[PDB]
Every structure is written in structure tokens, then in C-alpha cells.
Amino acid sequence: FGLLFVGFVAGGVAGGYFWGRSNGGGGGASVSSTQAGFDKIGKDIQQLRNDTNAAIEGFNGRIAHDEQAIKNLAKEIEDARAEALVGELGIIRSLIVANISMNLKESLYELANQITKRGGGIAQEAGPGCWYVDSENCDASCKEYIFNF
Amino acid sequence: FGLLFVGFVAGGVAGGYFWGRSNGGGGGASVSSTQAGFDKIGKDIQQLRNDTNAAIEGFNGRIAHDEQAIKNLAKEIEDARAEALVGELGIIRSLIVANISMNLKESLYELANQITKRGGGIAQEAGPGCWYVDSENCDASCKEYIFNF
Amino acid sequence: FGLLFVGFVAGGVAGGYFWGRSNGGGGGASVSSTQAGFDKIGKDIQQLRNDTNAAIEGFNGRIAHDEQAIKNLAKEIEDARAEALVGELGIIRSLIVANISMNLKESLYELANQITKRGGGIAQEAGPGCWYVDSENCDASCKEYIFNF
Amino acid sequence: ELICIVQRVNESFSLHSGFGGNVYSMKTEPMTGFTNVTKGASVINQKDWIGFGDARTDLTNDQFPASSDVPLAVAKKFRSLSGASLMLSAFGPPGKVDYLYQGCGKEKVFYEGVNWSPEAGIDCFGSNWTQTKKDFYSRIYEAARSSTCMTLVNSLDTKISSTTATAGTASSCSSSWMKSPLWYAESSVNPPQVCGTEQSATFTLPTSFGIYKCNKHVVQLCYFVYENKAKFNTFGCGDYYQNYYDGNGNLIGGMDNRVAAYRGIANAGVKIECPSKILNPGTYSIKSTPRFLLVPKRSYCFDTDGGYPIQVVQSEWSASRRSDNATEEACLQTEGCIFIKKTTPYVGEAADNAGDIEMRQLLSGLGNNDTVCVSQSGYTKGETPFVKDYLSPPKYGRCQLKTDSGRIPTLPSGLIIPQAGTDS
Amino acid sequence: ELICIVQRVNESFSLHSGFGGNVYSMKTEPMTGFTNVTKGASVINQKDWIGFGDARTDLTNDQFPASSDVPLAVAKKFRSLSGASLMLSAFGPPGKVDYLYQGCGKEKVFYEGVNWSPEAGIDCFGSNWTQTKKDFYSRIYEAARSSTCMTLVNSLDTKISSTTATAGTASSCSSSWMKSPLWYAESSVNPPQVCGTEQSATFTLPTSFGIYKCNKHVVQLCYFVYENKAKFNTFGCGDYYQNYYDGNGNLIGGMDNRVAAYRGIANAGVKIECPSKILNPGTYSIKSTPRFLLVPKRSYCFDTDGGYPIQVVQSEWSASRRSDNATEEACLQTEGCIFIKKTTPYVGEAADNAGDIEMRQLLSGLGNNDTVCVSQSGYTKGETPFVKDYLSPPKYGRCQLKTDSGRIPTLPSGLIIPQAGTDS
Amino acid sequence: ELICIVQRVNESFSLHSGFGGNVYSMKTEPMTGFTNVTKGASVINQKDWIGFGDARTDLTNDQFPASSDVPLAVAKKFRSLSGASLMLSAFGPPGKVDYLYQGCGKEKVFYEGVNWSPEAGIDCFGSNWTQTKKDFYSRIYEAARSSTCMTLVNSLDTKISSTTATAGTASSCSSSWMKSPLWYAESSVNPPQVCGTEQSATFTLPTSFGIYKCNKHVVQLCYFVYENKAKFNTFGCGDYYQNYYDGNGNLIGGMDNRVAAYRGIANAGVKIECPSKILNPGTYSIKSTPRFLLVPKRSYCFDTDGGYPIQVVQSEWSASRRSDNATEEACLQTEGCIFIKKTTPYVGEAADNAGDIEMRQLLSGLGNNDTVCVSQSGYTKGETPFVKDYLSPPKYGRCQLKTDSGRIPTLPSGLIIPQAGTDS
Ligand SMILES: CC(=O)N[C@H]1[C@H](OCCN=[N+]=[N-])O[C@H](CO)[C@@H](O)[C@@H]1O[C@@H]1O[C@H](CO)[C@H](O)[C@H](O[C@]2(C(=O)O)C[C@H](O)[C@@H](NC(C)=O)[C@H]([C@H](O)[C@H](O)COC(C)=O)O2)[C@H]1O
Ligand SMILES: CC(=O)N[C@H]1[C@H](OCCN=[N+]=[N-])O[C@H](CO)[C@@H](O)[C@@H]1O[C@@H]1O[C@H](CO)[C@H](O)[C@H](O[C@]2(C(=O)O)C[C@H](O)[C@@H](NC(C)=O)[C@H]([C@H](O)[C@H](O)COC(C)=O)O2)[C@H]1O
Ligand SMILES: CC(=O)N[C@H]1[C@H](OCCN=[N+]=[N-])O[C@H](CO)[C@@H](O)[C@@H]1O[C@@H]1O[C@H](CO)[C@H](O)[C@H](O[C@]2(C(=O)O)C[C@H](O)[C@@H](NC(C)=O)[C@H]([C@H](O)[C@H](O)COC(C)=O)O2)[C@H]1O
Ligand SMILES: *[C@@H]1O[C@H](CO)[C@@H](O[C@@H]2O[C@H](CO)[C@@H](O)[C@H](O)[C@H]2NC(C)=O)[C@H](O)[C@H]1NC(C)=O
Ligand SMILES: *[C@@H]1O[C@H](CO)[C@@H](O[C@@H]2O[C@H](CO)[C@@H](O)[C@H](O)[C@H]2NC(C)=O)[C@H](O)[C@H]1NC(C)=O
Ligand SMILES: *[C@@H]1O[C@H](CO)[C@@H](O[C@@H]2O[C@H](CO)[C@@H](O)[C@H](O)[C@H]2NC(C)=O)[C@H](O)[C@H]1NC(C)=O
Ligand SMILES: *[C@@H]1O[C@H](CO)[C@@H](O[C@@H]2O[C@H](CO)[C@@H](O)[C@H](O)[C@H]2NC(C)=O)[C@H](O)[C@H]1NC(C)=O
Ligand SMILES: *[C@@H]1O[C@H](CO)[C@@H](O[C@@H]2O[C@H](CO)[C@@H](O)[C@H](O)[C@H]2NC(C)=O)[C@H](O)[C@H]1NC(C)=O
Ligand SMILES: *[C@@H]1O[C@H](CO)[C@@H](O)[C@H](O)[C@H]1NC(C)=O
């Protein structure tokens, strides 16, 4: 329904990013395509995923100094220390997931913005990732220029 | 002034979410209603608040193992450990508050988006939560269709 | 290219926030100004920077109690404790930087929103920080009213 | 016409800050809270603990379960016999029950001791059995602290040098004597003219006993206390002495009046003192005045594989009998020992002295499958990381921390409005 | 026409990453920094500390405040008397001031000792009083480390066996003797023919003294040092000995030449040595050569309820007098002891030896209401969690950690531009 | 016409939550992982460690590098001589190599001991040299644990009282004797009539030796073991004794049969026992039976400036010779000691007993510039903070923690779709 929403589909049916169009005859009946040339999104995902290495390396490089002379494992203490470190890694994870989410959503906004200025101002934004086009002076080669499917 | 701003009111006067309208005669004089049917917002707030339990349970489930043979309380040490745990809980709190904020703001955007596509494209967005309507081919039943007050 | 993008410039050339305009004769050729009266942005930056003191004071006020009777520095242990505290300060930093980023970006959105309602609805939004104006019933004093350069 | 959703707040709204967005709300709710603390005994691991006790945890008592302070399932985890106590088995006084306490458990519950209190009226020349009791349990608790297991060693290998010395008895001890120490005497020493020869002995503390490894032994190195060299010479020639040496010859206990002053109470007559000591496995020597020789014959065997702080349960009679608080004081002065104490008298369901409602409440935690922390304040579940008041040590497990309720942060609730940017 | 706000950066801008948004800026500012460290003495809790001292902290001195190294309010927290020292009160030499030091405080400041230095010229057969001084304060600091309180015990219960023995005096000790130890001698022993009997004594270390609980006692178990059995036989028959035993008979101190070699310096004559030991409360025995018996008569009483690392302040004279650094060396070799030392000579305002500008600077922290950490490097306030250089131990309180300035993260400042998404 | 980008997910997508935005993805990847653990010896700091060894780490051996278990660069960090061992240098038996081990290093590797095994066949009246070996290395490892440095002290200052006593020799000891202890005997004592006088001696443990500070000394306080007073009286009058006292007179070692029982094995004849003890620097006394006196003449000097847990490397022969595992057992019972053990026999490249492929693999870590943790399980690099199984103690450095792989959180990967708000 346009970049503020994620919908679910059943059985087969591809997940991902598609072009969707609406009315026409009054009343129309919808339509959802089968992929565009969203090459930007693929590369952006790549960059965003690689950028997580910085936060992981920070965590991996931190190992507490210790010294134990004792001959038998202090298991309960060992487990508690691990549990604490796992908790910290859990916070970092939640931070990283949101960081990806927010920066992907923004990359998606930047994609949609290029489409707006591509047919501007024929496009007319209806919230992020949605547009209203006047089918009267944008035919089909016009629409294919602006949205590329 | 439309979802990017929060305003203050004095004495009595309800806080919350209201419908506000502007000009008309040149120059107009404003108007702010007394609630809509923002049923989505109420339910969304409910869901978002319940979703915080996950982060709290994570914190509550983490208790450091200890073993003390000593007979007198090591008070300064006990207090320091507590202070450190309270600090961690403080970070988690700040994370949770922003998480609610951001997801509520997004739920508000999704509300406004449904209104845009409801009278589309009669609506015309003026930033999030604001619209420009041409009072000439949207009368009153039209406006009440699109915004429902 | 309008608040979703940051561009780079070479040699001299000021960095910051500028007014940029596009087509005209078909095809136009761009233009980027030399500052506006973005007084809001300057003051907002000031407020946002001062607001970081809260998070720093929280960190500065937390110092672990300790008691050592030993006569020779346990250097490896001292260094590990410091390293752990530096790690925590690093997370807080990353939180603060994003908090500034997000609240500045929002202050920028609120600036752009005031401009939209200033010439409304002559303005017509093309994504955040961009507008399409019909040069036919907005002359020049009109544009200077709405955008102030 | 411009139509807008408008967001507004009251004086009733307060602003809550976030990293990446603030929130206005009228109400708040605390993010978390305190975990209840329950008084009494419990364990954090049901498959690694052991109890040692008496009738009050003995499922074979004729009056079970009325005579019991624990239910069947907990009683199965105890090693108990009616009428027994660690101390009774240490010395084995005439006609008392003599239970061979043994078992393994990282968590340990000691709930016995009452069966040798002043009420028992055991004499046997005892200077002050209550004092002996306190000293004895102190050594037990100290050794138990760092051991996984414990067992009575009911008979030490011993050997005396004299061939004329015979086993000693006294009317003050039911006309016989303790199992430990052994009492050896030569009928001839007589300060007329006959004075005999210095007596000698060895006793061995084994490195193991059955399946139990011994790293440490609790033993008593007893000595007699006479009124003064003269009253002593009623019996022996010269000065009294009973000295204990390790294998190399270092003195480790006993009473050698020849350097030490006499410390007996006037006309009380002869007394015996039995301090307990923790000794390593090995063979030990004794040298003594010719007439009377004392030789340790029992011990308690411990390892050093480690354990948790122990729980010691108050072991006293109902009001009608004469009790002591020696195991309480033993526990208080011994690090790693947690003491469980009733606030009301012991009133038994079976008879006067077995099956008490409060003790059953206090021991019911033994009990549970969900205890994560055990402390001198009581035990807790894993609800939150905080408690309202400190958990007093000794303590072990996932133990809560005290914090003021005001330092627990809150979360916005009720009607909520987001805020971001400077809005100006 | 398309009209846009345009965001642009220079080569002068650097990108700062965030979890949920980045920031371009030209300037940065460090997020936090180092806390200053002040040399000298201080306390983290003004209502739980105590000072022990001499004229330099005695508000009753005739020349106060000119003779003082602390202001009135701090002097009120000291227990001091002009001319006193812990060591002087331990022995009580003839004609020296004899102050009964006592008090309670988790934090402790020892600022005395100078009043018994080599300058004092106390003889009394002392082998090496500087050595004795170092040994004595070591025991004090060790015991003080784990105690809440301290008190002189100015008189032990003592009892000697001899009925002929009389109090001993010497011209080397102002023609009398110490308060402690007591010196008992029988006029008859004479190696002609008269040789007397082995002397005996007991001394009791109490379990309390006034309101003060005693768990530990610092005492001296002195012995005489003769040149060689022969020079010894100038005085006594056989070998010299003075042995100390606990109640059971274990040797705990003294000098028994009969097994130990002689260790006196040629033709120096008789010397007395007084090592200090930490003993539990109880009654102790002494056996000695017939002619000369030494008996401990004082102690310092400590508890074991706990305390913080202690502060010991350099206690030396101005240049004109003969000082020592025994309390410095006592403090250095004793765990939990923090030593405060001047870098310039002691120059007093009152007279030569009282009221020094540098010491007043060093003690002014005693002083403050906002000290959170005390260390062998000096003390700090609660500004930040970091210091530029390590705080050397011993130390206690909310103590800062060393980190390199480069590891302190920065925050963007000046002109700022947000960045998010990949912008491509 | 309304034209929209549409976001949709499958049953194959799972939702990952974030603080400020969720993410749908089909795949996940673990965020981090386990660090490999390598068996054998290593160091965390190449400029602060020292090795002590024998031919197997001796770069001057004729067959180097074939006779070596380490490469040249590591051999340069060892103090080793072919045929040597700490124990051989402690006693200095006739005709054995006598290397002066000395050096400094916070991390320490002990890789010697094999050169005095049962294969050596050293007699010298030894009761059980394997027992002595285990006792000796235990003391070394204990002292090494807390010391920065170690040095043999190859000659103690000693002085005996007798003027007739002469140096002792025996056919069981190559017709001479150890370097330490020294054996002094008077030819006249003869239980006929001639019985001589009690022998005396002193030995001094220095406060330093060369550039090395001594806070502690490992020494042996040997004594002879006779079958029974009678078999003893084959040689001496009365009871055998050899007692060790500190400067004050406290007994610290030896065998005094006069209080201690005899413990020799039937018709074995005379044996010598040499337990090792850790003593402070100072002067010590000896008293003994007239005929035979033993006097310690060597020590190992340690400081107390601190060190890391030590590494001890299995020191055994190839199969054809007679080995022992005394240094293994010494290491196991001594806290702070890490033992390195082969799983296959020792098969040397040079000859049978020098240059083993497995040992070279095990010692190659000594070796590396990037080891951050050393443990009884092996050593690790600084890859991640986790290991799959516990690193067993003793251990030191930046040591990994065990966690289950399932508790390691994941990150979304592959095709990804953001989610925020409630979308309803
Ligand atoms: C009865 C006797 O022989 N002696 C009197 C003895 O004084 C008599 C004066 N003669 N002279 N000279 O003085 C003591 C105190 O004045 C009395 O105790 C003693 O009488 C005791 O009578 C008690 C009963 O009150 C006992 O019978 C005791 O006899 C025993 C005993 O205690 O039962 C008999 C035991 O067989 C004997 N056993 C052994 C192994 O020694 C036991 C014991 O020696 C003594 O108690 C010694 O006690 C110790 C441990 O030192 O005495 C009579 O002594
Ligand atoms: C004066 C005397 O009796 N003896 C000479 C004694 O040699 C004389 C040879 N006779 N014979 N045989 O040798 C020693 C060393 O050669 C001299 O010290 C001693 O003379 C001492 O004179 C000093 C003054 O320099 C003292 O007067 C000392 O007398 C006292 C003392 O020290 O004041 C008198 C004290 O009353 C006496 N008090 C007691 C309680 O014993 C004291 C003391 O015995 C001795 O110092 C013993 O010292 C100790 C602690 O062992 O002596 C004369 O001895
Ligand atoms: C040969 C001798 O004098 N005595 C026999 C002695 O029995 C003879 C009965 N006489 N009487 N009565 O009994 C013992 C055991 O029955 C025999 O060992 C002893 O014979 C020994 O012969 C051995 C060889 O097997 C030795 O030669 C030993 O002589 C030495 C030695 O061990 O080498 C000679 C040494 O010079 C002498 N050195 C010193 C410093 O004492 C050494 C030593 O005394 C003895 O071993 C004492 O051993 C100790 C440490 O107690 O003996 C003959 O004794
Ligand atoms: C749900 O959607 C995804 C992608 O839209 C499908 O994933 C593809 O599946 C095939 C075979 O499993 C792979 O070869 C492709 O590489 C996958 N897509 C991508 C993005 O690489 C998935 O099969 C769908 N699941 C269902 C239930 O139909
Ligand atoms: C400010 O606004 C809020 C809500 O807009 C008011 O809260 C209501 O107050 C009454 C009585 O206090 C309650 O019964 C309602 O349930 C509240 N509202 C909500 C959202 O549930 C509040 O009273 C206002 N405060 C002032 C100063 O007028
Ligand atoms: C890049 O841009 C910034 C600002 O747009 C320039 O910063 C100014 O530089 C001068 C002198 O260095 C200062 O007096 C001004 O105060 C700076 N601006 C601001 C925002 O205060 C900077 O010089 C530019 N760099 C380059 C390479 O030209
Ligand atoms: C993130 O930044 C925002 C904006 O600077 C902070 O919001 C401020 O919070 C304080 C309360 O601590 C308010 O009094 C200010 O008015 C807020 N400023 C604005 C512009 O709203 C917020 O505190 C920061 N987040 C955290 C957790 O520190
Ligand atoms: C959150 O994700 C963003 C985007 O992937 C990260 O921004 C990158 O940061 C590095 C500096 O560490 C830059 O060199 C990259 O160019 C940035 N990428 C983009 C697309 O801007 C950011 O580091 C992450 N936040 C944290 C704190 O790790
Ligand atoms: C800036 O920060 C400080 C806290 O350090 C605060 O007291 C001050 O009021 C703040 N200024 C403004 C304008 O908020």
C-alpha cells in the first residue's frame, strides 16, 4: 500500500518490492506486478549489511582480562559472566537491527524521491512510495518514463 | 499544526489528537474540534505498550550469580552493583521510550496515509497529517467522507 | 537535492544549507544560492547540542566503589575496567549521535513544513525540503514570500 | 481549506526522553520491581544437596509424618536417625544413639544437635559440654564450608605402646566410657613409691573412608584438667601432661602443665576438655603422664572439592526441657554459615519435641524447585534483579540487589503523544 | 520550478556514525575528561573517621592554631596530646607523656610517632628502638586495617609466681623502668652458689576495655639479649631464657638461648628486644631465668568489625633534630596502609617543629565534604570516572580509572548536517 | 491512477525486532562466534617471560636443532644446560651437571626435571627421591607463582660449632656426598663408652643474591631415618634428633624421635629424608645428635613482586628409560600451575630422548606474537570473546567465556524489508 506498510502473501508468491497500480474504469480492481529494476535497493542492502561489521568488531575486540590460580572451574561464575556478555550483545543486536531498518527505509525514501523528480511535477506524492498520476496527459510511455514499469 | 508539532493548552482543555481546520473567507480564523473516531490510535497505543514487555523480561531475567561467605554486609559494594544495574536499566528505558515514540509516530503516519488514499487525489498532502482541499468540488459530505469530522 | 540527500563540494565552496532552484526555459540548468535566513536551524542546533549534557552527566555520575589494600598496581585489571567503561561510553556516543541526527532532521522537516503552509497550497511538496511552484501565478514576490530567497 | 490532525498536551502531560524520540504522557508505570524474600531454608539445586538430622527429619520414626518438620520428599534427602546428633556420634557416649552420618551435597542443611544439650545430663568428667559443643560444631561448619561430602569415621586405626595399660571406666560415665576418645590406664602408678612409665600412642587419620575422600579431619585432642599440681599428684607423679604431635614432632594440642598454668575450678575434681581441631590425613603421636592416656578414636572426614555456604537450623527442645544455643553461636562465628531460627517456641505435633508448625513453615522451602538465591535473610525466586532490603550474607546463587524504589525508571502509559525535533 | 533546500558538506566535514542516523560536522568536542588528583590526606565520609596525633593536631596546645597542621574543625576529629605517640604510650618510658589513645572510625589517620625518635635519647637497654618502632607500628597498622576502633589498654591483669621478686630499675632508664613491660628480679641469684628458681607469670588480654570490644591485641613479648652464655652467666645460672606460651602451652615468643644461638653485639652489654605480636584475647604464661622476668603490662585493643585502608602521615622533626622514617617503612610493608609524605623540610610556625605550610596543604583535605576516592596517589572528587594517570593503591571509594585521552569518544559540534540512508 | 511501490513478505520471512525499527528477512547470520583453542604452551607477552630447561631447550647442545623441542628464537629465551634439572642443582649429587638456574619473567615455563628420575639411579641413602622430587617441585611452583624471578643460591653462609667434626662420605653416594645438605660427623661417638656432644650449626638465607632480591627461600631441612631407637644406637647414644629452629627458637623442621615415633622400613638401613620448606630470609639454628649433623647449603631465591600462573612441561624419558610423573603431580596440587602433557611417547630426532615432534607442536606457541589467553585447556588469540567449551583454570590474560551457540544472536541477511508502526 506504499512504503508505510508491509503486506503478507500466501503459498508461493514472491516477497519483496513490487509495482502496484489501482483504479481506472470506476471502479478499478488493482494490479501488482512482478519486480522492477530496483537495482538501487539491492546495492543499498549490500552496503547496509556490510556496515554492521563496525559494531561487531567493536564487540569482538573487547575481552576482559582475568587471572585464575584455582584448579577447578568456577562454573557458576563463568556462566554468569557469559550471560552478562550475551545480554550486552543482545542490546547491540537490537540497535543494529533498527539501524538497518531505519537506513533501508530512508534509502527507499530516496528511491521514491528520484521517481518524483523524474516526472516532476506530473507525479504528485500520496505519502511515501505512492503517487497520483493524471492518466490524461501521461499516457503510457510517460508512466514508463517516470516509474519504469 | 499537523503531526510534526505538538502544541500546549492551558487550564482545562483536553490534550490529545483533534481535527483542526483553517481559512475560508479571507482571512479565516481557525477551528479545532473535539475528538474524531481515531480508534486506530487507541488500539495502536495498546499494542505498542504491550510490546515493551519483551525488553523488560530480558532485563528481569538477568541476575548475576554470587557467593558470599562473609558475615557482615559489604554495603558499599552492594550499592555500587545496584547503581550499575540501575544505569543499565536507564539506557534500556531511553531505548524503549524512543522505540514507542518512533513506532507511534509511524502509526500516526499510517493513519494519515489511509485518509489520503480515501479521498484520492482530492486530499493533497501538506506534510504529514495535513491536507489542502479545494472547497469547490469537495462540499461537506465529501470532506466528511475523507476525514470523518 | 532536498533533505533526503547530502551532497559534496570541492576546494573552497561553503558547506551547509542552501536554496537550490531548477528548470525554466526547457531545459533549465540549475542554481544554488549563498545562504538563506535559516535562523531556526542555527538555534535548533544549539538546543540539540545542549540537550546532550543530560546523557553525559548520567555517565559521569557513575563511578564504581572499590577497595584495594594491595601495594602494587594491578595494571592489567585496571586497564580492563577502563576498557569496559570506554566501551559503554562508545555505545552512549553512538546513541547520542543518532539522537542528534534524528532530531535535527525532524527540525529540518518542521522548517520545510512552515514554508509549505506559508504559500499554501501554492507550494506543493515534492518530498521533504522540495516544492513544485507554478511560475505562472507565483511571480517573484510570491516566491520570495513563500521561501524567502 | 487546510485540514490537519492536531497534537496537543496538557499541564497534566510530562515529557519522557528517548534516544530517537520523546513521548508525552499523563501516567507512568514503573519498569520493574522488588522480589519477595521468604524466611527460612531452601536450595537452588534440588539434585545437589544433603540434610543431616534427627527424629524431626527421620521418615522411619514411628510417628511420621506427625513427628516430622519436613514432608516425605524432603525427608528422603536427609540422613537422619531419631535420637542422633553429629556430636553424639563424635564421642559416642554410653547408651546414646550412634548414627553414622555420611553424604554428599554442594548445598548442606544441618538440622540436629538438640539430642546432646544440657537436658541429656551426660557427665563423663565433662568440664563444659556446651563449650565443647560450640567448639565442635564450629570445626564441622568450617570444614563443611569447603567440602562436597562428609562422613563420620567411626573407628581410627590406633596403637598404644604400653602392654599393661587397660581400658578406663568411671561412675560419672555410666560406669564405662566414650567411644572417642579412648581412655587407657595402668593400675600401678601410685605417688608410696610406684610411678610407672610415660605412655605413648599413635592414631591415623585416613586418606579415605569407604567411597569418601578425606582431605581434612575434625577430631578432638582431649586432655584432663586437674586442680593443681598437688591435687594432680593425688594420681600421678610429677606434672600432668598429654601432648599431641604430628609425624615430624610439632606439638599440635593437649595440655602440658609443665609450661602451662593450671586452669581447673576449685574442688570440682578432675575435668576433661575436648577441643576440636582440623588436621590433615596422617599418623599422629601422643605422649602422656604414665597413669592416664587419652587417644582420639573417631573423626569426621571432609574433602576440599568445594561447596556452598551451609544452612544450620536451630536445634532446641520445647520449653519444658533444658536447651542450649551452641550451634547458633558456632554458626554465627563461622564464615559461610547461614542460621535458621524460630521466633516462637517449639511445640510438636507428635509429642512435645517433634513436629512444629513454624519450623515446618521455615523448612518448607527445601521444598521448592524455583529458588535461585539463598541468604541469611531468606531465599528468593528469579522474579527481578532487585529487593527492597539487602539480602544479608552469607548468600549464594542469583542474588538480588537492593535499590531505592525511586531509582527504578518508569515508562509512559495511558494516552500518549510522540515528540521529536525542537518544534519551534 | 522546483525549489529545494540543499544540504552540502566540505572536505572539512567528517562523518560521525550513530545507531539510527549519522551526523556531518567540522568540529568535535570530547564527551568527557579527567578528574584532577590532589596529593595528601582526605576522607570520603566526614562522620566516620578518626585521627590520632600529637601537638600538631592538639587544639589544647598553648600556641594553637600556630602550632597546628590542621584547622579547628579537623582538630576536633583528632585524639591528640602534645608530646605523645602511640609508641610512647605502648611502653610508657619514664617522664614521657602517656596519652590514652582511643577512638572509632572506619577511616583512620595516624599522624604521630615523632615524639619517640632517636632525638628522644631513650635508652633503657634498648637494642635498637628505631627497629622496635618499625616493628611496633607495623603491627598497629596491620591490626588497624581490619578494625573499626582502637584503644590503648593501659594496664593488663598480671600475676607473678615469685614472692621474693621485686620491681626492677636501671640507671640507663632514668633510674627506674618502663610501664610496659614490667621488670621483676630476685636479689639472690648469684653464679658463689646461690641460684634461685625459674620465674613464672601470667598476663591476660581482655575481651574488652571500657566500651571497646577486643578481638585482637598488639603486645610486645620482650626478652633480654646477652653477649654469650658466659657474659650471661655474669648474672644467671645456666642458659638465659624468657619464653611466652598461650593457655595450652604453645610457644609464641621470647628468647630461649638453650636452642637458639646468641645474637648480641660485642661488649655492648645487655640489650632488650621487644618484638610486637598480634594475639587473641586470653591468658598467657611466662617462664624465665630466675633472676630476670619480663611481663607485658599494656596492649592496644582492636576489633575485627572491619575498616578502610588507613592513612599514615610522615612524623618527623625539623632539620635540627634527629628523626627516623620507621613509620614510613612500617606503612610501606603493610597492606592497606597509605603514606603521606612532605617534599620539603618541616618548618613550624609556632616553633621549629609545629605548624608547617606544606603539611597544612597536605592535610587540608581532611577537610573536605566532597572527596569520593582516597588513594596512595592522592584524593579525588566525583567529577568523571577517569584520571590521566593511575590512582596507586591502597585506595578506596569511588575511584577513577586511567584511560588514554585518545580513547575518549567525541561529539559533533559547530555547524551540523544529518545523514541517513545510503544517499545513492 | 494511483501508483505505488508495494512491500510484501512470505511465510519464509521472519520478523527481527529493533529499538527504532524492525526488519523482515528470510535468512539470518550469527553475529559472532567461537575462538579456536590450541593445546600446549604459549605466552601473552613476548618481552616478559622466562624458560628453565635442559638439553631439549639448550641451543649449545652439539646436536642443535635436532636435539631441541623449540626453535632458536625460543631457545634464546630459555636458561638451560644439557643434563641439568632444578632438583639436580638443589642437591648437587656427585658427578651430575650443576647448572645455576636464574632469571626473571612474569610468565614462566618449567621444562626440565627428567635428568633426575629413577633412571638416574642416585642413591645417597635416599628414602624415596621420587617423593622428594614431588615435594621439591611443589615448593618451587608455589614460590614461583608469586615471584617475578628465581635464582639458585649455590652456597649458603653456614657455620658449625664442632671443631672435631669432619666432612661426611658414603659408598652409597659415589664415595662422597651432596653439595646440599652438608654432612658433618665426629669419628669418636661410639655407643663401648665414648659419646661426644650435641652438634650445632647455623645457616643464613640471604636477603639477596647478585642482582636478585630474595623474599622467600626454598630449602630442604633433611634428617636421617633410622629403624628404631636400637638400630639407631648402632650409631648414636640416646635418641636421634636433628632439629631446625628460626632465630627466636621456634622449631620449624627436622626429626626428633624423642617425641615422634620412628618411621623407617625394616632392614632397609639408614635413609635420608629431605622435605622442602619455604622460609623467610634470616639466620637459622640446628641442634643434632653428636655423631651426624645435616646442614642446608643451597636454596632457591624468590621475590614476592608477583607473577602469572606458571607453565610446567611434562619432563619424561623415551619408553626405554625409567621416568616419573612427580613434576606432574607437583603441578596438579599447586595452585597457579598449568601442566603441559604429551598424548604419545617421547621419540627424539637427535637421539631417543631429545627432539620430539609432538612436544615441538605443543611448545610452538612460545612461539607466537598474538596469544592473548593462556589456560590449562590451551591458549587463544583475540578473535572473539567466546569459546565453545570452558577454558579450564589456571588461566590468565584476555580469556574467552563459554556460551551455547544458540544464545548468540543473529542478524538479518539476504533480501530485507523494513517495518515500523503497527501497520494496521
Ligand atoms: C576411691 C578412691 O580410690 N579415691 C578417692 C580419692 O581419695 C581417697 C584418698 N586416698 N588417698 N590418698 O579421692 C578422690 C577425690 O577425693 C575420690 O574421687 C576417690 O573416690 C572416687 O570415688 C568415685 C565415686 O564418687 C569413683 O569410684 C572413683 O573411682 C573410679 C571411678 O571414677 O569410677 C573407679 C574407676 O574405676 C577409676 N577408673 C580409672 C580408669 O582410673 C576411676 C578413675 O581412676 C578416677 O576417677 C580418676 O579420675 C581421673 C580421670 O583422673 O575412679 C574414686 O576415685
Ligand atoms: C656494679 C655491679 O654490680 N656490677 C658491674 C658488673 O661487673 C662487676 C664485676 N663483678 N663481678 N663479678 O659488670 C657489669 C658489666 O661489666 C657492670 O654493668 C656492673 O656495673 C653496673 O653499673 C651500672 C652503671 O653503669 C649500673 O649501676 C648497674 O647497676 C644496676 C643498674 O643498671 O642501675 C643497678 C640496678 O639496680 C640493677 N637492677 C636490677 C633490677 O637488676 C641493674 C641490673 O641488675 C643490671 O643492669 C642487670 O642488667 C640486666 C638487665 O641484666 O644494675 C651495674 O650492674
Ligand atoms: C662397616 C661398619 O663399620 N659397620 C657395619 C655396621 O655393622 C658392623 C657391626 N659392628 N658392630 N657393632 O653395620 C652396618 C649395618 O649392619 C653396616 O652398614 C656397616 O658396614 C657398612 O659398610 C658399608 C658398605 O655397605 C659402608 O662402608 C659403611 O661405611 C661407610 C659408608 O657408608 O661408606 C663409611 C663411611 O665413611 C662412613 N661415613 C660417615 C661420614 O659416617 C659411613 C657412615 O658412617 C655410615 O653409613 C653411617 O650411615 C649413616 C648416615 O648413619 O659408613 C659401613 O657402615
Ligand atoms: C517467498 O519469497 C522469496 C523471494 O521473494 C522466495 O525466495 C526465492 O526462492 C528461490 C528458491 O527457494 C530462490 O532460488 C531465490 O533466490 C529466492 N529469492 C531471493 C530473494 O533470492 C521464496 O521461495 C518465497 N517462499 C515461498 C513460500 O514461496
Ligand atoms: C488534560 O487532558 C486529559 C485528556 O485529554 C484529561 O484527562 C482526562 O481527565 C478525566 C478526569 O481527570 C479522566 O476521567 C479522563 O479519563 C482523562 N482523559 C483520558 C485521556 O483518559 C485531563 O483532565 C486534562 N487536564 C486538565 C488540566 O484539564
Ligand atoms: C567548508 O565549509 C565551511 C562552512 O560552510 C567553512 O567554514 C568556515 O570557514 C571560516 C574560516 O575557516 C570560518 O571563519 C567560518 O566560521 C566557517 N564557517 C562556519 C560554519 O562557521 C570552511 O572554510 C569550508 N572549507 C573549505 C575547504 O572551504
Ligand atoms: C535526545 O535528544 C532530544 C532532543 O534534544 C532530547 O529531548 C530533550 O529532553 C529534555 C528532557 O531530558 C527536554 O527537557 C528537552 O526539551 C528535550 N528537547 C527537545 C528539543 O525536545 C532527549 O533527552 C535526548 N534523548 C535522551 C534519552 O537523552
Ligand atoms: C548505522 O548504519 C549506518 C548505515 O549503514 C552506518 O553508517 C556508515 O558509517 C560509516 C562510518 O562508520 C561510514 O563510513 C559509512 O559510509 C556509513 N554508511 C552510510 C550508508 O552512511 C553507521 O555506522 C551505523 N551506526 C553505527 C553506530 O554503527
Ligand atoms: C544546557 O545544559 C545545562 C545542563 O548542563 C542546563 O542546566 C541549561 O539550562 C541548558 N540550557 C538550556 C537553554 O536548556
Numbering used by the authors:
A (entry chain B), B (entry chain B), C (entry chain B): 9 to 157
D (entry chain A), E (entry chain A), F (entry chain A): 3 to 193, 197 to 429
Q: What does the report in the manuscript say about this coordinate set?
A:
To avoid the enzymatic cleavage of the receptor substrates, we generated the catalytic mutant for the binding experiments and for the structures of the relevant complexes. Thus, we designed the enzymatically inactive HEF protein (HEF-mut) containing S57A, D356A and H359A substitutions, and expressed it using the same method as wild type protein. For the IDV HEF-mut/receptor complex structures, interpretable electron density is observed for all the three glycan rings of 9-O-Ac-3'SleC, including Neu5,9Ac2 (9-O-Ac-Sia-1), galactose-2 (Gal-2), and N-acetylglucosamine-3 (GlcNAc-3); while for 9-O-Ac-3'SLN, electron density for the first two sugars is well defined. The glycan rings of 9-O-Ac-3'SleC go through the open channel between the 230-helix and 270-loop. The open channel in the receptor-binding cavity of IDV could provide a structural basis for accommodating different receptors with diverse glycan rings in different cell types, which should be tested in the future. But the majority of the interactions between ligands and IDV HEF are made by the 9-O-Ac-Sia-1 moiety, whereas the glycan portion of the ligands do not make significant contacts with IDV HEF, except for a hydrogen bond between the Gal-2 of 9-O-Ac-3'SLN and S173. Compared with the ICV HEF receptor complex, the 9-O-Ac-Sia-1 of the receptor bound to IDV HEF displays a very similar orientation. The 9-O-acetyl group of the receptor docks into a nonpolar, hydrophobic pocket, formed by V275, F229, F240 and F297. The absence of two hydrogen-bonding interactions between hydroxyl group of Y127 and the 8-hydroxyl and 9-amide of the ligand, pushes the 9-O-acetyl moiety of 9-O-Ac-sia-1 to the other side by ~1.1 Å.
